[PDB]
Amino acid sequence: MENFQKVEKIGEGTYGVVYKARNKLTGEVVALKKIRTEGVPSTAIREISLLKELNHPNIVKLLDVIHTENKLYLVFEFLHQDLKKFMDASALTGIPLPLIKSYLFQLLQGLAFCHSHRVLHRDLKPQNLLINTEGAIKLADFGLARAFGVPVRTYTHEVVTLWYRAPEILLGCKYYSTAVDIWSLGCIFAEMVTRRALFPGDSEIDQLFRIFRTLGTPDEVVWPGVTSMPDYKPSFPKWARQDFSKVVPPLDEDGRSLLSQMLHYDPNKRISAKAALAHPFFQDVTKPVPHLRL
């Protein structure tokens, strides 16, 4: 690196390889993502650059956008662990409710900020939620999906996770709204509670049908306009809705109520991040210290 010294390979993101690196001058430790293919669109450059101004305590700071040697690198603030790893580490005992609540509350504040600035994530997942020893959790990769357009894959033929995708995306809607992020966060909230993914689909249709089997096959009553969606088929099986008491036991009624509002089929009926912050579920929210082993 011209100014960095790769510490280690953090992993293989959806856009490219990511390294933990140290700025040789400032000495700061950061996450360096090499972006994937042969030109680097200027449209993307301007858009990404805009994200450098999107600063909030629950949003991973984009420190720099480096377009040199016709290559694109994104420099982000570094956090030591992601929520997917934390959940696996907490699988035996489960993340305590107070911490689940603190994290959900912080993530909603982050979404409320991004959404008020007209920035969507579009691909939220546990691996994109980073945590530190102080009890903070931050959203990573906000705005990259729109700026870089179609995702497709990573760069090493890795399989795209569909588990957190909103039904309107699965049904072929071409215009995303802030609601897609609320849906993904609801799926993550449920996973923290039960310690099992809510809708672990292994294909686009399996993803959609897992959603239908749990929440009921949507119709014009609960989702006006659904039968006119691009990929909707009248031949979809019609499953009856299950009770939330069976979907996220043993979450209390405040929790089930909030989750039900984050998983409404109609994106327009889905609760906003701002409104969710006011839900009675957060009446007793606090900020616990997580047991993090680094």
Ligand X SMILES: NC(=O)c1cc([N+](=O)[O-])c(NCCCO)cc1NCc1cccnc1
Task: Pick out the residues of the known binding site.
Answer: 10-18, 33, 77-79, 82, 125-128, 141
Annotated binding-site positions for Mg(2+):
128, 141
Task: For strands 62-68 and 129-131, give the pairing.
Answer: unpaired
Does residue 164 bind ligand X (CB under 6 A)? Answer: no
Residue spans of beta strands (DSSP E) within 36-114: 62-68, 71-77, 81-82
Annotated binding-site positions for ATP:
10-18, 33, 77-79, 82, 125-128, 141
Instruction: Please report how close the Cβ of residue 82 comes to ligand X at its closest, in angstroms.
Output: 5
Yes or no: say if 183 and 207 are a contact pair by the CB < 8 Å rule. no
Q: How many residues bind ligand X, per CB under 6 A?
A: 17
Q: Which residues face 4 on adjacent strands?
A: 23
Which position among 22, 62, 63, 76 is part of the footprint of ligand X (CB under 6 A)? 76
Among 75-83, 164-172, 174-182, 257-265, which window interacts with ligand X (CB under 6 A)?
75-83
**What residues numbered 93-132 form the site for ligand X, per CB under 6 A?**
127, 130
Task: For strands 17-23 and 4-12, give the pairing.
Answer: antiparallel
Which position among 22, 33, 125, 165 is part of the footprint of ligand X (CB under 6 A)? 33
Residue least distant from ligand X (Cβ): 31
3-state secondary structure of 82: strand
Among 11-19, 43-51, 103-111, 186-194, which window interacts with ligand X (CB under 6 A)?
11-19
3-state secondary structure of 51: helix
| Tokens encoding 181 | 């992020």
Instruction: Please report how close the Cβ of residue 136 comes to ligand X at its closest, in angstroms.
Output: 13
d(CA 32, CA 26): 15
Instruction: Please report how close the Cβ of residue 16 comes to ligand X at its closest, in angstroms.
Output: 9
- Show which residues are catalytic: 123
Which position among 21, 31, 208, 226 is part of the footprint of ligand X (CB under 6 A)? 31
In sequence order, which residues have a C-beta less than 8 Å from that of residue 89 and are 6 or more positions away?
293
Yes or no: say if 243 and 74 are a contact pair by the CB < 8 Å rule. no
Among 80-88, 154-162, 201-209, 229-237, which window interacts with ligand X (CB under 6 A)?
80-88
| Tokens encoding 284 | 């007793």
Instruction: Please report how close the Cβ of residue 11 comes to ligand X at its closest, in angstroms.
Output: 4
Instruction: Please report how close the Cβ of residue 99 comes to ligand X at its closest, in angstroms.
Output: 18
d(CA 55, CA 73): 19
In sequence order, which residues have a C-beta less than 8 Å from that of residue 244 and are 6 or more positions away?
251, 256, 259, 260
Nearer to ligand X by Cβ, of 13 and 186: the residue is 13
Q: Which residues bind ligand X (CB under 6 A)?
A: 10-11, 13, 18, 20, 31, 33, 60, 76, 78-82, 127, 130, 140
